Every structure is written in C-alpha cells, then in structure tokens.
Design a protein around this nucleic acid. Sequence first.
DNA 1: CGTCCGTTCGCCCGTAAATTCAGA
DNA 2: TCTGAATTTACGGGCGCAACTATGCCGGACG
RNA 3: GGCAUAGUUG
Lengths: 1319, 66, 502
Amino acid sequence: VYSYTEKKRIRKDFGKRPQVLDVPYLLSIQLDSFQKFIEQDPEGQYGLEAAFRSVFPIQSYSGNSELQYVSYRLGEPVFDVQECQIRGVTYSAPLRVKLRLVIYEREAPEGTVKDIKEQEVYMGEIPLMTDNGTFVINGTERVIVSQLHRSPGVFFDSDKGKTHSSGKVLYNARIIPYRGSWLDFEFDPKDNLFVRIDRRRKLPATIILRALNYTTEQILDLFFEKVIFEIRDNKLQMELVPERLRGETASFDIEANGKVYVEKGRRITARHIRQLEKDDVKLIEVPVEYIAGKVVAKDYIDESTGELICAANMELSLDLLAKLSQSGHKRIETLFTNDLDHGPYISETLRVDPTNDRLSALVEIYRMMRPGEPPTREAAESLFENLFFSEDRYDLSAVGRMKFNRSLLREEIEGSGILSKDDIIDVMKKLIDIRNGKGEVDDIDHLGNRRIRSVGEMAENQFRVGLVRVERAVKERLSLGDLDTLMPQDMINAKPISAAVKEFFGSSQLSQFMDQNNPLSEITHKRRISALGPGGLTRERAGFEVRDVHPTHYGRVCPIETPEGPNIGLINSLSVYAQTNEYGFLETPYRKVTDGVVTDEIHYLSAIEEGNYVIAQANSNLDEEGHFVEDLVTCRSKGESSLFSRDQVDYMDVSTQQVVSVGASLIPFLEHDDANRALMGANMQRQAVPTLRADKPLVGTGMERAVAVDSGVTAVAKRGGVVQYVDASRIVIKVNEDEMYPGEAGIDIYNLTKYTRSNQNTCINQMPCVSLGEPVERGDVLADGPSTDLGELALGQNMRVAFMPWNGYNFEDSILVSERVVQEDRFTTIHIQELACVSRDTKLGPEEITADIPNVGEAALSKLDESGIVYIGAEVTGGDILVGKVTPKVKDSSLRVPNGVSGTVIDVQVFTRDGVEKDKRALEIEEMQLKQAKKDLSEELQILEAGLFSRIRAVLVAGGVEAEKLDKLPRDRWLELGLTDEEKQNQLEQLAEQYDELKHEFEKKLEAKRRKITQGDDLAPGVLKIVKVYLAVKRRIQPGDKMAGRHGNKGVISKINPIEDMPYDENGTPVDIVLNPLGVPSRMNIGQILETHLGMAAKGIGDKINAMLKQQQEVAKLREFIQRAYDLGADVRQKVDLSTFSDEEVMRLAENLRKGMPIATPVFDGAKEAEIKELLKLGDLPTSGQIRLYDGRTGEQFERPVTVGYMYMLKLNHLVDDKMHARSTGSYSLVTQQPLGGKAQFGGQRFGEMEVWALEAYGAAYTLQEMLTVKSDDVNGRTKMYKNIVDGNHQMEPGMPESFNVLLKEIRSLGINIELEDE
Amino acid sequence: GITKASLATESFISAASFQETTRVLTEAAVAGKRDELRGLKENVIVGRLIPAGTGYAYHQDRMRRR
Amino acid sequence: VDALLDNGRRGRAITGSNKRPLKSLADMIKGKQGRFRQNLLGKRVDYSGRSVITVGPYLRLHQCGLPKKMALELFKPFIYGKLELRGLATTIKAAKKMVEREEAVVWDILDEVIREHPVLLNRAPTLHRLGIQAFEPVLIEGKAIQLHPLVCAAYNADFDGDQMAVHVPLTLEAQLEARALMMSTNNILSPANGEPIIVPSQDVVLGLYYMTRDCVNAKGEGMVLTGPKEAERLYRSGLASLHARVKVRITEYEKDANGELVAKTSLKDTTVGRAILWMIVPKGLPYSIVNQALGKKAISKMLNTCYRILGLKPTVIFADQIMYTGFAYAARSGASVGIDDMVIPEKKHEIISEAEAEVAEIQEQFQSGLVTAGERYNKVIDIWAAANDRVSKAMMDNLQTETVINRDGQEEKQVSFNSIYMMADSGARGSAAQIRQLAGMRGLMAKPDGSIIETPITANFREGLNVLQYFISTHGARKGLADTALKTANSGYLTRRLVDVA
DNA sequence: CGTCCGTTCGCCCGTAAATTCAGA
DNA sequence: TCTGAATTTACGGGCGCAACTATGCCGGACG
RNA sequence: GGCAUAGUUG
Ligand SMILES: [Mg+2]
C-alpha cells in the first residue's frame, strides 16, 4: 500500500535485492551531536553539565570561600529564526546559571557557613541549532563541519626509510592526550631510547624515569631479567633458565651430568633445547671469557672500605670480579641482554644520559622546557608534576584512556584522566617489544584510530576554554572579596565565555558558510567530515597517506565524493548508513549471521571490531528462508576481499548503497561509471541551480525522496489529517481525531516561505503540492521547496538528447541546445540579490536618504518615491538609482544597480538606529508590516477558533445534541449550555479555558510584536540607517553557461540552435540537446548511455500513457497497461498492484505518468541491460536504443542510427554573465599604482609571470613593455597613453614602473643603500 | 645545478627575484655588487625593452651610441 | 628592531591580530607575494578582460569571436577618440555618456576600430609560448568568447567551463608584434619540436576517417567517375555511398621542376569520399596523401608535408578547409555511441572460468606445502595477467572484424564500422586501454600501498561492477588524482627554475 | 559608550657546525 | 695526548598558474 | 581596499 503521497506517482523500482534497514535521518549526526550539548544530563557526562562539573566548584589558593554550581538553563530566544535572519543578529539563547556562594570562617570545615546565596547569574549566550542542523550567526546561515581527527591514546610508528640512509626502521611511540602535552619516545640508529615533550630537544628516555623517582638498579630490574652467578665451589656455576638458550652461539662446551648437550664452538639446536628442557637443567658451569662482556645489574660494596666498588650498569670484567671476590659477594645479578630478542637499549640509555639523581632529571627537564631561565628545584618539581600528572594541564579523555588501555592489552577500559608511572612504563615496554620483533606498528589512517569531533563536542570544548578564564578571574577575586555584601553576579564576567563561543561559531575553520543552492548541497554540507581544522592536519602538510582511500572506509566514508584540488581525501563525506560510535568512531550496520540463516537483526560495527570477522557482500543471493545460494560467497576477512565458505560468514552488508554517500547514491548506473567521472558527477550534482519548475528525474535511484525530505526544504506534515485551506503561502491541516491530543484543538498551520534569498543568491520558494480537501498522513510533503517535485529531489530537467557530432558545435566538450529549451523556460533560474545602502555618521555632516540629488534629471528619479527609495516592483536595470543618498562636502553617493544587472525590486527593508526620526517610507513599511502581523495573528486565531468550534460541535452531536436552536444563540455563548453529568462537560470547560488562554496570549503577543517592530535597531557603531533592496534577476540561458549531467559530463552551451535546424526523427520531434559521442570512450562514464536508453524507455511508457489518455479510453485498458509496465522486471521486489486504486487513483497516477514513467535504478542493484531492452520493447521503441535521425537543415537522413534518449541535464551555478568581465581604465591600488584585482572591484587581469615568459619567448618586446609599464603602473606613462589614444596617436612613453620605486624604497628602508647610478 | 647556477649569477637582481632574496641581497650589499641589467629578467623588473625580440635592435643601438 | 627588519628569523615571531605573524620588510620584499614575483615580474594590466570560451567552428584560423560588450568596454579610449574625430562629441564627457548609453552610432565606431586590431587571448596556465596568441576580433552577440577549434590543442583548452583572458595591444609596435609574431596563423609548428600544433583534434579526424574509408560493397561500387566533382555530385544526390570503391580521374600536380607545377592525370582506384577530400587538397601534394584511411597521425603528416612543400598560407587555408569538411562529414555520418557498440566477447566467460580453475588449483598446490607464499602470489598475478591479455585480444579481434558483409557471393572480412572501434582507431578519442575496459575485463588493480591485488576486476563497464570491485577502482582513482595534484606543483617549480637559470 | 597602551604532528636538499674516528 | 677527515646533526631554503563567491577585521581593556 | 579563513572553477 501507499500513503496517498506515493500513490500519485509511483517510481518504477528496478532493485532486485530487498532492503533491510530504512535509510536513516541523514541529518542525525548534527542534531544528535548538538542535542547532547544543551540538554540536561543528570550523570554529567555530556554537555554543559560536564564542563560546569569539571570547572566548578571554584576555591581560592587559601581556604577562604568557595563558589559552587547548582544547575543551568537556556532561556527562550529573544528573536525567532526568521527575525534573526532579517535583523542580522545571532540566533542564540541566554545561558542562566544558578550559583551558590559559601563562606568559610575560622575552623568551619564541616560546620555551618556564615552565609549562602543562590541567584541565577547570566554568563553569555550560546547559538542554537535550527531544526535543519544549521546556525544563524550574524544573519547568515552557517554549518559546523564535523572533524575527523586523530584519536587520543598511544600510537606506534616506524619511519621506515626516511632516515639513516640504510633501511633501518626506527620505532617511535606518541602519547596524544585530548588536552595536554605530547610525550614521544623514539629510537636512533645507535639503538638508544630517547624521549621528548611537545617535540622539543631530544633528551634521553631514562631521564623521565629518574624524574619519576626510580633508581638505576630498580630501573634495570624493571626493564630486564636477572642472570644469577653463584660462586659455590669455583668457576661460577650459573643458575640457568633453559628457555633463554635459543638463538645464540655457544662459545664453550655445554655439558652437565656426564652428558655434553652442546659441543665446543657449535651453536644451540632445538634438539638440544628439548633435551635440556626434559633433563631438568638448572645450574651449569661457565668459562671465564663469558663474564667479560656481561653487565652487573645492581650495586655492590666492599666490607673493608664500606663504599662502592662497582656501580650498577657497568660491564663486568676480570678486575671487577676479582675485587668482588674478596668482598664476600657470591650471588651476583647481571642483565640478560640478548643480541636479537632482548636488546640492551635501557642500558645504553643509562650510559648516555648524564642524570644520576631526581633533582638533576627535574632540572634538565626544566631547562629543556624553559630555555635560559634560572632553574630552581621547586619550579622544576612543579613543572614536572603539572606536565602529565595534573588534571588541569593534562587530561586523557575517556576515549584516550580506552585507546591507551586497548593498545597496551589492558583489561579494563575505564581509568584515570592523568598519566602515571605505570602508564609510561608500559608504553616504554611496549615500544621495546615492538623494537625486539614482537608486535607491529599501528596505521594512523585506520578508521579505528580516528575519531569524529562534531559540533556539540567542539562547542563544549570552547565553552570550557572560556570557563577557564572565568574560573581564574573568580579565583583571583575571591582573595579580594567583600564577602558579606555581594551576590555571585559581579563575580562572574560574562564577556570571556561569550567571546570564546562567538569566536568559535563565527570565525573558525569549521564553522563555515553554508553551501545553500540545492537541497543536496545543504544535506551534503551538513554530513561533511573534514580532516582539517583546529587540532587537525593542514593541506600544505598532510599527503599521500590520509589522501588515499583506506580499506576501512567501506561503509563509513564515501570513496568517490571528495573535492578534487587542494584537498582531495581530506574533506571526506559520511556514508549513508554510517553512524558515530559512543566514543566517536565511525560504525556501519551489518546483518547478523548466526547459523547459515542470515538473521534480520542489525549490529553496528566499528573499524576495529570489523577487522576480525567475515562479512558477506551485499549482493549475495538468498532464498526466502535466508541462505547463501552459492556454496562460496565473496567476503572480506581482514581488509582483504576473498572467497569464503557458506558457513564461516558472520555478518552481511545491510544494503548495497552503504558504501557510497547521499550525493553519490543519486547517480543512476553508478557501477558503470569510472571512479573519476563519478566523483565529478557527485561534486557537480552538488552545484545545480533550482530552475523555475522541478522535473522529477525519469531515471532516479530512489534516494531522491529521502534527500528531499530529510533536508529541511519541504513542508512535511507533522500530524496527519485533511487539508482544509491551500493558498500560495499557507497550508492549513485539520488533524484527524485519532492523532489529536486531548485538549487543544488542534489544527496545523504551515507558513510557506515564498521567494527569498539563499546564501548563493538563488531562489528559495516553497510551492504547495496538495489540493483542498485532500487527505494527508503523517510524514507526507505538503509543500515542495526549491529543486523538489512532489517530495522527490529534482535538480535539473530531463531532456531529449542525441549523441552525434553536429558541425563542430559540440566539438570538444560543448553542448548544443535548441531554441525549444530556451522557449519553454525550463532552465530559467531566479537569482535574488541583496544590495545595501548605509548612511554613516561621518565627519563634516551626516548622510541623508532624501530624493533631492544633483547632477541627475527627473526621468532618472521618477522611479523613486518621495523618500528616495525605489518602489516595490520597479523594473530597474543597470545604472538605475535604487536608493537616493547624498554625502556632505554635497556629492552624489546614491546606491545604484550595478552595470549589466537587471531585475525587479521585490522587497525593501529599512533599518533605522534608535532616535534618528525615520522618514516617510520607513513609517509606511513599518505600519504595513504591523498591519500584516496583526492580520497574521488574527487569521491564525480565527483558524484555531474555527477548528475549536468544529471540535465542540463534533462533541455536541452525542449526549444531549442540539442542532435546531444551537445557532439561535450566538456561537460565543457556549458556556451556559445544557448537558448531562459526564466528562464531556469537563472537556468543554477545558476547551473554553484553552480559548481564554489563547485570547490572553494573543493580546500579549500582539503587544510584544508591536514593541519588536516599532522599536529601534541595533546597528553598527557609526551608521544612521540601512536600506536593503532585493532585486530578482531572471537568468534564462545563453551560450557560455555550463550545463552538466550526473555522470561527470560537463559542457558549456555553444549555440542556441533554431528549432527547425535540430535533428528530428521520423515523427518530426526534434532533439532538445546534442552531445558529443567522443567524450564517452576516453572518459569511461558509460552510465550516461544507459541512462539515455532507460530514459528513452521511460518516456516511451509516458508517451503510450499520454496517447491512451488524451483520446479518452476506459480505465480498464489504462490500468492494464500501467500494471504491465509496473510488472516488467526480472526479479524486482517492488510488486505494486492496481486492483486497489478504485478507478480514481489510476486516473490521477496516469495523469502524473503521462510525461514519462519515473524509474528507480539503485546505485549497485540497478536495472540490467536486458531489462532496459524489455522496457523499450514494451513501448514502440527499438531495442538497440538508436533511431534514424534526419538532418534539420538539409533534410537528408543521418546514416549510422544515432543514440537518442532522455538525459537528466543539470544547470550548474557557473553562468557566463557572472564570469564575463572587461576593463579599459579603472581604480588603482595605493601602495603600487597597479589596477585592482577581481571583478567585484572593477579590476584588471593579471598578466602574470608565465605570461611574461611567453611574451619573452616571442619577440614581443614592445607588447611586453606596454604590458608592464604603461598599462599597469606608469602613472605619467598611462595618462599620456590614454591622451594619445584619444588623440588617435598609438604611441607610448616608456617611463619607469612605480612598483620598482616602491621596491627601491623598501630595500632602502633596511640598512641597504640601493640606487640607480648615473648613465 | 639549475638553482645553484641561477643564484650564482653576476647580476644580483635576477638572483634576488629568484629564490633566497634575503641571502642574495645580503651578499650583494656586503660585496657592493653592481648590476648592469643585461639580461631579460632585469629589464622586465626595471621596465624597459627586452633585449631579445624587437628590443634587440634598441639595445644594440644603445650599445653603439653609448 | 630585529622583528621589524625580518620578523621571525630570530624566533618567536610577534603577532598582532589574533595569533597571525605580521609581515615585516623582508616579508614584503621576499617570497611568492613580495614585490619581485607579485608586482614586478607579473602585474595586473588595463584593457584586459576574461570570459568563458565556446567553439565557433565557422571562424577562420586567424580570428576569434569577441563579445560586443567586452569589445565596447576594452576599446573605450579608441571609441572616444573616433567619436571626437567625427565631431560627435566635442568634450570627452559627451563621448563617455554616448558610450555608456550604447547609442546606435557607437557600434559603427566599434566595428571600424575593431577592423584590424589584434587581441591577445591567453589561457590561465601559460605552460608554453603558444598559451597566448593574437587573433582578429569578430563582434559576437553574446557573453562568451568563441575560440577556433584548431588552436585548442595549443591552448590545452577544452570547453567544459574554461575561461580565457583578452588583452588589447595599444601602441602600433604592439599591434604589429601581435600580427607578425603572435598571430595564430604564424604559430603552425610547435616550438618544442618540428611537428605541427594545429592538428585537427577529435571531430575533424573522425569526419576525415569516416569520409576516407571503404567497404566491400556499397552503392555505386566500381562505377567510373570523371573527377572529384562528379564524386561529390553523386554522393550529395544519393546515387553513391560516401565510401564505395570507384575509379576516378585524378589530375595531381607535382612540382619536382624548378618550382613549376607539372600536371599528371591518371585513373585512381579509390573511394568517393577520398575524391571529395581530394577536392580540398592544394595543388602541390601527391594523391597518395589521401588514399589511406586518414586517422589522426595521417592528417598530422598531411599538414606537415603541406607546410614543407607549399609554405605557410596554403597550409593555413588547407587546415581551415580540413576542419570545415571534417566537421561537415562527421555531422553527416551521425557517428553515435550505443550500448551495443561495446561488444563483449563470447569467450570471456570461459576464459575467466579457466583462470578461476587455475587459481583454485594453485591454491590447492599452496595449501599442500608444495609452494611458498611469494611464488604463489607471483604465479597468480602472472596467470591473471595472461587471462586479461587473452580477453583483451579476443575483444579487440571481435571489434576489428565485427562486420562480415556480403550479398553478392562469398563473405568477406572488412575493418569494422563499429562506432567505438572507429573512434578508437581513427585516433579521435580513446585508446586500446580504455576500449579494453569498456568491453573486456579492466584487469588487475593496485592497492594504495602500490602492490598488485591477486584478484582482478573481471567486470567491464558495460557490465556492472559490484561493490568490492568499485571500491578497489576508487583506491586506484584517488591515488591518481592526488598524484596529479601534487605533480603539477613539482612541474611548475621545475619549469620556473629552468626559466630562471636560462 | 569615549578613550588607550601590551602550540608540535610533511618531504627533499644543501650547508655549516658539532662529533667521532684515526692516527703519530 | 694534539689534530685533521669524515661522519652526523641541526637548520634554513623551496614546494604551479589564473579566476569567483562569502564572512570577520584591524584590540581587548579603564574613565 | 588590505589580510586571513572557507568553499568553488579550469
Ligand atoms: Mg578545461
């Protein structure tokens, strides 16, 4: 069944595979991230609660007082979103916090404090996220882009062959905290362990171990095993572990108990290892040459001298053994330093470093961190204690602790925020283990090692940054506080927090201007995962490792949607089904496979969990019970695709679209497109301009409705019901009694947003798509916005295309467009431009906005009113005066339309500073706006009252119904009625109480609206009044505009061909667009040819329906043909039936299908070629997809039948009238008298360095000389050249460029005397 | 090499307009170097005829009539 | 003082506006945005414009289409001069007002000042000296420049949204340098080698390949023609096919004498299209130059021989005529692209089955311990490469001899008239590798680490790649895009160093 | 509102300085 | 125990061209 | 009208 919005126009679905998981709310990431920032969290884990609990309570350095925390609250925003956009303010809510200040007197640790005081202090505002995932920051709409940064924790890397020029890989380890300093351990070609903090000077690693109060002997005992030499009788019979004997060369004869295990000189074999293990060998005799290279573990002293004889970590020789022989020491501990498995790295590090005691380590660290300062014991101790071991200056977050414990093979995942001795020790031991040969380094690009910072998380970090300053100020103030006089309002400074949050939201690398020219553009800007930003990479630094596609990007990051250019692969886009883990990692759904049956339950797996599993591919054939039909299925085990058994499979892909994003899933036949062309197609689909009328892609993918609805541009019905009233700018829905809450009646009013400016100067305009008295259900579109047709995304228009060369007018990449396309006004777009005229309080007098302007006639000022502001609806062109303004000396400084720009003034807004005596036009605008507000409030009140009286009348039909004399009494006199004793009279009283509340709130809101409209406006400092004029230009089409398709097929229009010159088929229908066949082989986007053929089939179905419909036929034949069309497919799973449409929905559906049958081709489960042939054969169209075409001009038939069809062409936002520029003479820069840059400034083209080389390669010495002297910066030369050109003499005086004089002055401004010596 | 040969040029303006402006200018200032601007980049920077194409005749004329 | 003279050289660069190291004197005289490389070596110039380029195939090689509004804005001083000369404005304010109102008389002035005043057209990455060329303006009722198709190869300019800048040579020496040195008709040969640079690119070569071709039996096979004019009269009236083997009478001129053209008439066995093209070739060239299939290299060498024998002006006229006739007959061919033109070999499935059986047997040989991992990997890679080569050979044969046409007796093989095959063989667009991925398997793919994958993509683009194969192709494509982006900078730095040294 | 003074994390290469061999 | 060569290490240079759109700002703090 | 940031075009 279909809920009356998918029953008007059913898109034919060629998807074989059945869907399992519904496509989620695509804007879930932004909304869910910001929701756990403002909402109250009792546990205190998320949001502002976490920040407040982390900062508060605030004490002093001494035990004087303490300011603690109670709760926070977000007040109601002062301005609505629309009002916020109109005025130019930020859309924010005041953050009011309850604080209690307690004061501690002499000896009151647990006793009652002197006084307590709780007040709701105000500390700044936080911008609020609109219901579409966007913010309004200064009247513009911005999006905070999610960041894909490097997860906190410990990582191990190699640095394979970039150093030592020998191929010896190093092994470094980095401990990245969420907020703190970096600790890096490293190796060197000499195999010594080194440490560094914040990537400063490389000091030895054991220095930090000593700074942790570890002596040399315990360090060696911690990083090494002990070999025991006991001098029992003689020759130092050594206690031996049989396991330690594998891998070395025996220099002596290993014999014991009359059984020579190893002969002299020979190595140690595995056979002898087994024999030693099974013979229970513990102590063996050793020679004298063996101890000569060993290192003593700990220290020893003599009994005579009583002092040190041999310090720890010193190579034992015959002298040391002889000296300790007489001391009485028989048990000697030595280090086991194997050559290949247990290296002596800590020993060599202890040798190299000059530190011996803890104070020396601390002072060395202090000198490294702070260079040149006089170091002190106390200062060094404090610095090292606050480096990694203080909760203020260092904090591993929960993710940092989890990754730290996982990478060290720990048991628990929850621990302390700060580091400890054991953590650093374990990191060093793990790095040494990696060096020895056990374990492998981590890959930084792995998606199990990269988090997702989002808007809420970054906003709360910035809030913490702001709160830290406020905490410091409060700590400082508590020592100078007049305690029993003030409340915690003057204690808190609301400026730092607000400044920090406004700096983050307004001027940041991730809170960026929203790309709003297309619903797809918005919905893919919100789901953008950027690797740059604060705490991330930079496009001039990262390369070749984060740019490429990683095998863990499957199902989490789109492989084809990434901006080509400066940052490819740094601005990845989130996949369709990808969610964010609890810790911030990207996870993707999978269907569980317990037995051979594929269970219908979904588990979200992240990258590390997915690494050890076998996941069957999405295109795996299954039966009704659910089983892999093949006995060997294609899966991927550990980042590697292969073939696996029918039983081993553990998970399966939920859907075949889960690898691509919402921009790359709108490309029909993506699987036939080359990856580069698909990338271009997605990135250009982002840039389509909303045309006059959307045109419902004939060949879609089925994701159009999801993208159109999930992005907020339509009017989706909140509660189902019956449409009561539909005008162009408002829809009224009477909710069904089943969905109506007990109490308020209870109908929905949707105020459509008519023609308004987007961020890209396009048109946003919602149009109703429902008629009066038409039932709607919950979640149905009521108004389709820009680039939307009946709730389906519709960017471009689908036009009849022919692939053939045409006299070179589609030579390389060009398009050829008929005059029928420009006559039907189907690529005509509306562009709304905002022009501001500001009257600034300047010196020598203020600026007036009067209509009395000199130097102009009355015909020029005839379009203005008496107040000097153009009328609404005037067709002003380039050069017309929009807003008359003069500035004192008087001179004309009026706001005029820029040259070349036409259009109609559609809306004029006047902003006046308080107390400036607004003129007549501002008064007219404000009185008409107040009347409009009163009209809107009265209309909503009377609509609600009509609904309320309807509900009362419906209630009054049972239990004492009165229908004859009910209208005799006035409808307002319904409080003194007659009724029995039941809850119905209580419901009537509830309705009356809600009506009284409506009346009171209506009066209050009318007064509030009058106050908010008549009041002054908070303008910039120095401006008197601002007048904003909104022109509505209409750009039709012209040679030069760049049109494209969905498969990376670009092309600028080269000619607007006459209707009778285009090629036509046998029926006389001309093709709308001619394309070049030669672009298909080289750029392997075969998907456009298949889209052409399938669109031809769809339009053939539509033409058949149109023929059967225009000459009236019975509904039986019509429904028979529609059912045959919808039942055409190999193993499709749509299965729509027409026996349940009741002969009035079949007619509506056929009316909607008479312009072609919409067809859904899933992104990788799409229509096969054979099905396209069958659908073409269903109409009267050839199977091959090519028809003979006749030349328009000559009339002769083109041989080699050409490929004709219907391609869904888009009009990108690269228009030639916005690209064309020219300049003869204009303004010139100040420092260098060279022409300005750009075209917004009337600037000149840059004849750059390579152009100078190109002229030098010719013999053009005079052309170059006039290029870089007369035409650029020779002031006298250029004035003389202009005078000579006007005089008709083309000759230049060379002169000398002014920029050379500037360079001479700048070099002379150093201590360098540079001059031009005399001739 | 091309960069070492283009920095070790008797005319210091070409080397200054190439990489390492600071070092080249420091060397030229300390050594008191004098530039005859007899190349193509120097005359571009100064803003006169390039001694290559139609400007070769002019440069020859100014050498003959020095 | 040390921060004023060179901020940040000592260390701890001072910042003034929200942690941003400020520019000192050294920063203002050095770097990419100093005075040398930003304001002295390259400057912004007056009398300059910029617009999106389109095709305009009707243009002659020495001229370009310039919009009326761009020309009016660029030549404003000249228009003022002519208006004052003709007495239409005593002062310059009146002339400025007349021009900004765009009266009916300023357009005649613009047309008579455009007459023979070249304009320099330049595309943004001016890699070589052919990246800026002088053309004669033709006033166009539009907003987009019309760039002659032949110069696109020299500019490396397609028409997918490129923009080009126009500069107006003011002084007489500049105009004469543009006409005598930088004209598009003077830049026939590339300065890097001897080969021509105005070679017809893609549609002209397709038209000339389709026109100069033959099939085993067509309309008017074997009829005797009295000359190229009768060949054109037969083709245009429908009495003979464009490519039909006929005997024509060709009178070719050989200038092996002391610069004198010597006539020689013969009966050449050729096709109708070859004679029609012979109507274009100038007098000095032999008829053997158009008796072949005329791919892209053939047209290149035809232009090269024309330049070497006849000179500059005949070569320019010949190139313009070649472009015109190639566009005309490429349109006449209707050479489209379909889904059935990418013929999949019937033996692809069995070859893939054999390769899969062989990899299964190699896996069996490895799991038993007969071979190690490295040699198994090498064996699998080699056998998949062999299977890919066999598939490519099969598809190439099936597309080369796709047509087996006869109705008067025995079947005869001929070079196929397939659209994809003709576009690839003529040299117009595509190559063997691309047509291979269109029909045959696209073969082995490499991981981002650079190592080859054992399992290739056994699916072409006519068939649908599944998710894994497409993901691996995305690996390969992202690597190439990143390499191109990071290689353009290295090439630019190398060429800047080469320019500076010499 | 009018005024008014103080964040490490890339790759490659050439070059000068610090370090280490390797003697007599 | 002095002294020169070779090695290693720290550090400063460099890292394509042209074009368009938008916002934020040029400073945060005492009378 | 200068810088920075972000996005985009070839
Ligand atoms: Mg291009």
